[PDB]
Amino acid sequence: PQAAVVAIMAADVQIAVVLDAHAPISVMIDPLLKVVNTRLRELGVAPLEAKGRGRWMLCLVDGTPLRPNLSLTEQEVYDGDRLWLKFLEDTEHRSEVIEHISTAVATNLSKRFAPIDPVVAVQVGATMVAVGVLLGSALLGWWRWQHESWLPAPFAAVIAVLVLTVATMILARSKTVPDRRVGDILLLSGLVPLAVAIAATAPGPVGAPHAVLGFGVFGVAAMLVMRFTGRRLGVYTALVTLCAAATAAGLARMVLLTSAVTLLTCVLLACVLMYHGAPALSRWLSGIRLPVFPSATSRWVFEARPDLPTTVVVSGGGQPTLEGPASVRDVLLRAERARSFLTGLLVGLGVLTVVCLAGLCDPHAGRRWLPLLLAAFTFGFLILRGRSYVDRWQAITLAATAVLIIAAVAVRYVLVSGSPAVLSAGVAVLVLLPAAGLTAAAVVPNTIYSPLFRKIVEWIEYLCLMPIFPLALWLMNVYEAIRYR
Amino acid sequence: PQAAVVAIMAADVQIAVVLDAHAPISVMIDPLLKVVNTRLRELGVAPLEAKGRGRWMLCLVDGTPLRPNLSLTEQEVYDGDRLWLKFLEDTEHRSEVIEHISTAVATNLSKRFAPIDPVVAVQVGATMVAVGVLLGSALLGWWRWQHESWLPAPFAAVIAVLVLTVATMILARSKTVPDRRVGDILLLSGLVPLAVAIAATAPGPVGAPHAVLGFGVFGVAAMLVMRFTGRRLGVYTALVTLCAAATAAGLARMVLLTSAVTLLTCVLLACVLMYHGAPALSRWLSGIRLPVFPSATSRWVFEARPLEGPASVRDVLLRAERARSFLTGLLVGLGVLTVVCLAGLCDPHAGRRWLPLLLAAFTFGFLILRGRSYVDRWQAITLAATAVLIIAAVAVRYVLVSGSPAVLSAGVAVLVLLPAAGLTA
Amino acid sequence: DHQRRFGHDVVGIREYQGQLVAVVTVWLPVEAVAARLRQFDVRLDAIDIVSVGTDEHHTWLVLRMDPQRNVAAVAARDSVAATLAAATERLAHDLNGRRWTARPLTSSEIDDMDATVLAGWVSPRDITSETLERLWLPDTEATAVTVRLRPRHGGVEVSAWVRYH
Amino acid sequence: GYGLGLSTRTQVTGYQFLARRTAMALTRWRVRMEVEPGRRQVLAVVASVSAAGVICLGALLWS
Amino acid sequence: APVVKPENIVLPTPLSVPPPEGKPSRPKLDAMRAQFMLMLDMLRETAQESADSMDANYRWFHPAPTTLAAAVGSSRMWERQPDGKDLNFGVVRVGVGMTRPEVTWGEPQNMPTDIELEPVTGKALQEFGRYQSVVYNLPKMVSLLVEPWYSLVGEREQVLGLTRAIICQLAFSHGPDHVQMIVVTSDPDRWDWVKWIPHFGDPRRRDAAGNARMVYTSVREFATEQAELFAGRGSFTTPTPHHVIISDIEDPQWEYVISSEGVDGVTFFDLTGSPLWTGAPQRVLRFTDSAGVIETLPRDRDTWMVIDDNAWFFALADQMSEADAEQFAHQMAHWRL
Secondary structure (H helix, E strand, O other): OOEEEEEEEEOOEEEEEEEEOOOOHHHHHHHHHHHHHHHHHHHOOOOOOOOOOOEEEEEOOOOOEOOOOOOOHHHOOOOOOEEEEEEEOOOOOOOOOOEEOOHHHHHHHOOOOOOOOHHHHHHHHHHHHHHHHHHHHHHHHHHHHHOOOOOHHHHHHHHHHHHHHHHHHHHHHHOOOOOHHHHHHHHHHHHHHHHHHHHHHOOOOOOOOOOHHHHHHHHHHHHHHHHHOOOOHHHHHHHHHHHHHHHHHHHHHHHHOOOHHHHHHHHHHHHHHHHHHHHHHHHHHOOOOOOOOOOOOOOOOOOOOOOOOEEOOOOOOOOOOEEOOOHHHHHHHHHHHHHHHHHHHHHHHHHHHHHHOOOOOOOOOHHHHHHHHHHHHHHHHHHHHHHHOOEHHHHHHHHHHHHHHHHHHHHHHHHHOOOHHHHHHHHHHHHHHHHHHHHHHHHHHHOOOOHHHHHHHHHHHHHHHOOHHHHHHHHHOHHHHHHHO | OOEEEEEEEEOOEEEEEEEEOOOOHHHHHHHHHHHHHHHHHHHOOOOOOOOOOEEEEEEEOOOOEOOOOOOOOOOOOOOOOEEEEEEEEOOOOOOOOOOOHHHHHHHHHHHHOOEOOHHHHHHHHHHHHHHHHHHHHHHHHHHHHHOOOOOHHHHHHHHHHHHHHHHHHHHHHOOOOHHHHHHHHHHHHHHHHHHHHHHHOOOOOOOHHHHHHHHHHHHHHHHHHHHHOOOOHHHHHHHHHHHHHHHHHHHHHHOOOOOHHHHHHHHHHHHHHHHHHHHHHHHHHHOOOOOOOOOHHHHHHHOOOOOOOHHHHHHHHHHHHHHHHHHHHHHHHHHHHHHHHHHHHOOOOOOOOHHHHHHHHHHHHHHHHHHOOOOOHHHHHHHHHHHHHHHHHHHHHHHHHOOOHHHHHHHHHHHHHHHHHHHHO | OEEOOOOOOOEEOEEOOOEEEEEEEOOOOOOHHHHHOEOOOOEOOEEEEEEEEOOOEEEEEEEEEOHHHOHHHHHOOOOHHHHHHHHHHHHHHHHOOOOOOEEEOOHHHHHHHHHHHHOOOOOOOOOOOOHHHHHOOOOOOOEEEEEEEEEEOOEEEEEEEEEEO | OOOOOOOOHHHHHHHHHHHHHHHHHHHHOOOOOOOOHHHHHHHHHHHHHHHHHHHHHHOOOOO | OOOOOOEEEEOOOOOEOOOOOOOOOHHHHHHHHHHHHHHHHHHHHHHHHHHHHHHHHHHHHOOOHHHHHOOOOOOOOOOOOOOOOHHHHOEEEEEEEEEOOOEEEEOOOOOOOOOOEOHHHHHHHHHHHHHOOOEEEEEEEEEOOOOOEEEEEOOHHHHHHHHHHHHHHHHHHOOOOOEEEEEEEOOHHHHHHHHOOHHHEEEEEEOOOOEEEOEEOOHHHOOOHHHHOOOOOOOOOOOOOEEEEEEEOOOOOHHHHOOOOOOOOEEEEEOOOOOOOOOOHHHEEEEOOOOOEEEEOOEOOOOOOEOOOOOEEEEEEOOOOHHHHHHHHHHHOOOOO
16 A cells, blocks of 8 residues: 655654555554654664643644644655654644745845944954054154154064064964954054164164164065965055165165255156056066976977866865866966055055155246156156056056146145245146046047047157156256266 | 744745754755745745756855754754745856966956946046045135135135036936936035135134134035935035034134133033934934935845835835934044044143043043944944044143153053953953 | 735734734733744834723733834835734734634724723832732722833843723 | 076067066956057157166266 | 867967077067967867857756755656667766867967977967866766776775765666666665665565665675676667666675676676775776875776776765765655656
8 A cells, every 4th residue: 555754853863654645644643653762762862752731743844733634645745755743732833924025135134234243343443453553653753753762662662562472363363263354454553663663773863774774674574474474465565665665765865865856856766667567576476477488398299187176165074075277276366466466566656656746845936847847747657557557446546646646746835835826726736637537537438539639649658758767867967967077 | 852933035935934953954954945835835926946956055144055964053043043045056167277377367357356447437536526626625724724815715616616516517417327426526525615715705814703604604505415415414414513513613702702621511511412312313314304315225225126015115214224324424423523622622731631531531431331332333333433532632632742751651551552452352 | 004915814003103003812821922022033112911901801912113123124025014014913823822812903993992991090010920910909990901011131121000990 | 397597589588478468468457469558668668768868978078 | 958069170380480590570579479379369268168068068967966956857867778868878977077178179280390489389389288178177977888897995985975976866867767776785874865765666575665675785685686697798889777786795705796797787886995896997986085086097088988097087076975865865755757
């Protein structure tokens, strides 16, 4: 006769039984408990026993009971079905309130009305500790500048040492597997008090070489942090750029005792040259290496068919392991590293070129039109250079750099000079030039220019790129020196 | 043994079930699907079906799948939680290999990062012209602060009217996209030169009349752009809060000759009242029935969907989101007022200098206590932030204007230790 | 106001900047209906057990919900009325069983309930348990006993009061 | 294999070609090189430095 | 069923350059290099589209063992007859690995001599030939009709996981009327999950639960003498039920019923690799890595014939736990067709 074979769940173990497919539940539930108890005693588990009043009765997985006066087939139970054998205080325990809810918005909206998760609290606390230590280092440096004394140098060192040790202990994985953010934030923040202490160690009103050593130790510390951690490449890359430029300028300041105008101009030429080598340096730092060429090997067919990387599942629970392509997977990782380096270079060079064009002080009468004209050429340079970059934040970095050069020169002329004409011109350029940028952004992608005009606009870039070196030499007066020396 | 009542959801239907708490997920995932299919077929709704190749997963409503080899209890599902019954498509496919270094780099960056496009470009232009006109208005204010010239006010007026007309034309003509925030940025930027233009018409030396007039007109214009547009309503709420306080201070220095300390303390009292008043006042402001432009969350709810019927849930969602934005704006504005008044009061060269330090300590405790109350992330973050910045401001002022190594050491010590104590919690 | 759904029965809703729904039930019942105060995603503001006396005797559970505390739960559902209708049907089907039958109130009989509560005085008491039986004893022409359940600090805290005649 | 050694003109110009192609891939996410602006503008920098040196030699003589 | 089309693509001819000669066209060369590189990229995208077609074909025909919970519609769709479905009737998935694509890279003609060969184009063509000559992470399969037996050598749990994946692939893709299975074991508690599967049902003996389960605790215990009157097998360059016999008993009695030639229409999976079954290196699937990398003699993609006689990487084994196999078995037991 027909029989159904089902898996009875009882006492957290699975027991397969054979049941009559046509007798009612209440007929066959009496020997079934005996069979299940016998199997539980074979397994050496505490047998099923009742408490209070009720009946032994078989529920589906959700808890709805089977009708005891109907067979298994009349209730649509088939082979391989799982039934839970339970003792229930009453024969009625359904929950018939089915409810319509759109699952997409339900599973969506929960994560963005979420309350404050304490991991977010830890991240916020780490951020605010970072702001605090930055303010403390800044105040200690300001005190060392204003009040030349031995006092601030050891205190900054102690704070830096304790913060870096705390950060390293955090990064030591004893408290942080997934959120390296806390460790990176604390580590980056603690480096500034170290540089402040090292700079304040040197005597004199300023840190003795006009704070070469502070910027140098900051730069090398950031280089080593990238070398060991390699996570936040963009940020430390920008800081390394700024520190390198500051150290070069300070070393030339103390060794040669040259003018600050000469220093700013040569740093400007350095950034101008560096904008063109920035893609190359970002390639080189990322570890992307172009293939080695065969010098004298005659063989050219290599059927070595390189093997497979088996990416083991991070749970480590014996799950089926997946396969990447080859060793060339690292081209992907080095690619985002290269993008991060290039973004960092663009940010740092932008900051440096904005700072260098703040070396424009007096009104335009006399020789002062030459550095302003240099500013105009570098503005056209950077604002047309943005075509060569596709990622939005690099293009925005160049455009922002270009407009901030004009912003900085205008605010310096209007603040230093007391001429109302200078004020009117400055506010006029501040309101018109970004408005012109907005109109250009609105119109240009939506209209079709002549290829001739496209060639001219292509050539303003080169035509304003060229004359900046003779203007730089005019500002440095190298020509007059060669005229006279 | 334990059983956990949970409500699973699948095929736009939620069903309450009583799952065994100790049997593994892989044991229950099979019959549970049969139960759900039975219930849906009884309702006349189309049952769940497997498409292609994949496997069924019980997932938390946040989106993570549960582990098939572990029961609910080991992976900390508790009674009353909701589960989601997905059919994950099998992700297992071939791995593309691009052997050439240059082509591989090009395609990997092109596939994985966002290129610049006109949608972002117009917003960048609007942002930078906003920054430019804010600098221009602040700069004309600086010149009128330093010099008695009447002529800056025509410049501020003309630039304000030009940018406001351009913003209005963009808002009217180009309302068709959520990139109408270009107009909002311009209008927010252009209200400021209008305010400094009106303020610069106050004759004589600069002072409270210029201040009361400028902040009064700027707050009034903020309230009008609230009622006419109602899109950027959080930031206008913060701005009208700041203008309300500044206008009250200006009328207190014109109608009376009150000292600065008394006004700063009275503003502080108003702020500590207002921190209590804020969560109910925002629910009043929810009902102002300003025009309905949904913000991001409401937009991206409405894209996934079409007192009874959907109009009710639409109204509820819009009201709730407006209330949230109002309350966030209020907290930010009150935080700014709190930090500026505690900065103003705490002068070290005062005989009564011990008292405002005490006030700072008590209000620090008060805000941190209140930070536990609100459920939204950025509201509590704002309260904690302004709590940190009050001690930051008093410490930086004491170490700046007082040239003593002792107060320098004390300030630089507490400024690192106390946020570290916050980090410990 | 009335609502129908996938569910079984019509639920009466009254709204005045917030919703009011009553469930009638027909001795000593379990005090733990407060478990259904916090359902899966909806958060009811209060549960009031209301019982009135005179000879007749009637018992109702009245439900309070603020949608503004439940925007996430409402936004997934088809309407704000269908939310509290679903919660009402859950509580009604939970109670419905052994001896006491329960059903949601029709909108007309909500006002009938209001009239029978009015029918035309002592202080609240703090220590609540087992005093309810001795509280019903004193002579009256009418008496209304009510116990309020509210969520509180993640738990449920109980308060009650009674008036006579 | 790999190591310090000796290299020819064709190898070094080929290396420079791959460097420029990788630079275009990195900056612009395109690799088609029917025209490359990078060469054009680095030659503009070279012209800048050459003109600077020329005017440097020019001002050495007269005064 | 998705379709895959073969191709034949000749590689482009690399550039040539004369060396200089002592002493007592850079832009043209770079333009030629650029044109070569673009042609190479066109060939690469053609390779990608062909590889995606073949990927979709194989994973249509051979799903992952985990994804066999969807046990209807495509279930048991293979057909006995020696045509059409014969292209996949006998063959089952064992893991993922490399395979040669459907494009056949023609050897580029007019190759310049090794001194005239330009460095960049030569190296790029070298790399193209190296990497585009295989497709990575495609299912690797084992044909039951070409070998008398296969042997699994490795740790106990790896071998059991692969065996469960094999059993489940056979059960899903082949009906009970075409494939029947036997398990001969010394550890019966690990094979208790197979009682659900219909293919283990012996039609001749009936019990209360239905057909008798074909799981035996010793090779001597065999009452299936009907499957042992066959001859030694002819390899398939179809018998009505093909029998698959798992064995992990480690019994010296095998060589009586197992000649060097095997048995016709039956294939054996020797778990617990022993010197009796490992007497042919092409029939040994040896675990090497802890993760489950298999090494065996490479075979032709189309004809399953052995290519060379040294062991090489074959596949990363699909190891499937007891819980997943039991879930599939409960799903599979519902069906009767």
